[PDB]
């Protein structure tokens, strides 16, 4: 999409991610881990259902109308009736085509957006304690056990307490 996240700087998706649509994998003092992010997943899904609801189940009652197929050859009236119906169908057929085209382009971008949002959001939490590796991963420059990581996923990560440590590791030879 337009954000270059999905199908972009995130090289590929995770078939192993079943908890949700977005999330983290990590590697810390306590081993390796995977986890979903609900907020973001649900933010995407809520929208698509928005779309669905709009398009699906919004039908109108129509009753007696004109004839649209004939056996006897008549001329100027049947011609008019056919062309008239013919026109309706074509016009509606175009609407339905353009619709899915629009929506889908939007759905893609919409989902790409949410991938970039969770990224930047996370980035912003880490402040000076980590560096974008450019593959959708942050190298965090301090010991960050599962509770620490949790804090990040929770949104409750306090950088001021690791800052000195992180800055240390970020800046020397060695």
């Amino acid at each position: 999409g337009i954000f270059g996240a999905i199908a972009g700087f995130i090289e590929n998706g995770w078939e192993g991610m079943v908890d949700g649509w977005y999330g983290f994998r990590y590697q810390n003092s306590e081993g390796t881990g995977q986890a979903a992010d609900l907020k973001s997943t649900q933010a995407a899904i809520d929208q698509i259902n928005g779309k669905l609801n709009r398009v699906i189940e919004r039908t109108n009652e129509k009753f007696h109308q004109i004839e649209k197929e004939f056996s006897e050859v008549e001329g100027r009236i049947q011609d008019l009736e056919k062309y008239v119906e013919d026109t309706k169908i074509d016009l509606w057929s175009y609407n339905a085509e353009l619709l899915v085209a629009l929506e889908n382009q939007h759905t893609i971008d919409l989902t790409d957006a949410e991938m970039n949002k969770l990224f930047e959001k996370t980035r912003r939490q880490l402040r000076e304690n980590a560096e974008d590796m450019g593959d959708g991963c942050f190298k965090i420059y301090h010991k960050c056990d599962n509770a620490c990581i949790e804090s990040i996923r929770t949104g409750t990560y306090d950088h001021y307490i690791y800052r000195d440590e992180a800055l240390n590791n970020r800046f020397q030879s060695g």
Partner: protein, 320 residues
């Protein structure tokens, strides 16, 4: 140890789906949903709508009251089905603008015939025919009244009927086109007849044509059917020198949500809210490729047979 790594990512499936965008004809996403209804229920659901099977009868023949269409005397409908193998068994006929009259009945959505006490003195009523049998004996249309000579005279009839009801009365009448000169005289005395029907607002005078046509169930004569509406306050009037097929009353016009459709599929005990000639179809999707002919709360018909709207993200599986 003294660093950690935190990787962001999204999900992906193994068996994805293709969809159209503004820039791609076929691009793969995790999921999608179909917006085109392609297949039909198979048959016609008796519910939710009041469906009526035409069987051997066309709507016009039920209106008219063709003996083999007497089952539909007291019948109304939401949708009336006309079968292809249906036919007529009464006296051969033709209507100027058959369609319009068919449509005008179908929309009103009933065949219930309120009789009126017409009088026609100096003329014998209830003409019979060997090509319109009710039971074994010779009958005619139940709702039309073939007038012929009484004794040695067919007097110029001048008959009225005021519409004092709270609605438009629909009247149905016709005229006899004889096969030969000698049927004309030997049935209506006069050598050339007339039928003027009129109201305060309008008129319609018909004159018949003598001479034989092809046989239709053994009849080279014809009966052309006409109709007339009458608005509350207005008065009906008939004037006939000869060859009139009189009416027995009126149909009442309701502003209906009724209609008629040409279908050949069986009616059954399923349920739906929309109906086509191919059968009932599912309501839920916004579009449809079944048939441009439909009734009721019903999807839009479009030329394409499938339009998948993506319901998930772009699917990006691991590359080999």
């Amino acid at each position: 140890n003294n660093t950690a790594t935190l990787c962001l990512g999204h999900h992906a499936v193994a068996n994805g789906t293709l969809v159209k965008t503004m820039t791609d004809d076929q691009i793969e996403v995790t999921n999608a949903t179909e917006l085109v209804q392609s297949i039909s229920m198979g048959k016609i659901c008796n519910k939710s709508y009041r469906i009526l099977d035409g069987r051997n009868c066309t709507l016009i023949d039920a209106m008219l009251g063709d003996p083999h269409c007497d089952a539909f005397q007291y019948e109304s409908w939401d949708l009336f089905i006309e079968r292809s193998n249906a036919f007529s068994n009464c006296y051969p006929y033709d209507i100027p603008d058959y369609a319009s009259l068919r449509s005008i009945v179908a929309s009103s959505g009933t065949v219930e015939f309120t009789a009126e006490g017409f009088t026609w003195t100096g003329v014998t009523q209830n003409g019979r025919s060997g090509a319109c049998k009710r039971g074994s004996a010779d009958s005619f249309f139940s709702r039309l009244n073939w007038l012929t000579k009484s004794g040695s005279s067919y007097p110029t009839l001048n008959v009225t009927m005021p519409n004092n009801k709270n609605f438009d009365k629909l009247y149905i009448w016709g005229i006899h086109h004889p096969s030969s000169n000698q049927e004309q005289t030997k049935l209506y005395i006069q050598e050339s007849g007339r039928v003027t029907v009129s109201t305060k607002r309008s008129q319609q005078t018909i004159i018949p044509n003598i001479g034989s046509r092809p046989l239709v169930r053994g009849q080279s004569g014809r009966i052309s059917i006409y109709w007339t509406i009458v608005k509350p306050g207005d008065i009906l009037m008939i004037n006939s020198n000869g060859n009139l097929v009189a009416p027995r009353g009126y149909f009442k016009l309701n502003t209906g949500k009724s209609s008629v459709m040409r279908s050949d599929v069986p009616i059954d005990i399923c349920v739906s809210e929309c109906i086509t000639p191919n059968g009932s179809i599912s309501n839920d999707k916004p579009f449809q490729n079944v048939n441009k002919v439909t009734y009721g709360k019903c999807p839009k018909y479009i030329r394409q047979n499938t339009l998948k709207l993506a319901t998930g993200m772009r699917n990006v599986p691991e590359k080999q």
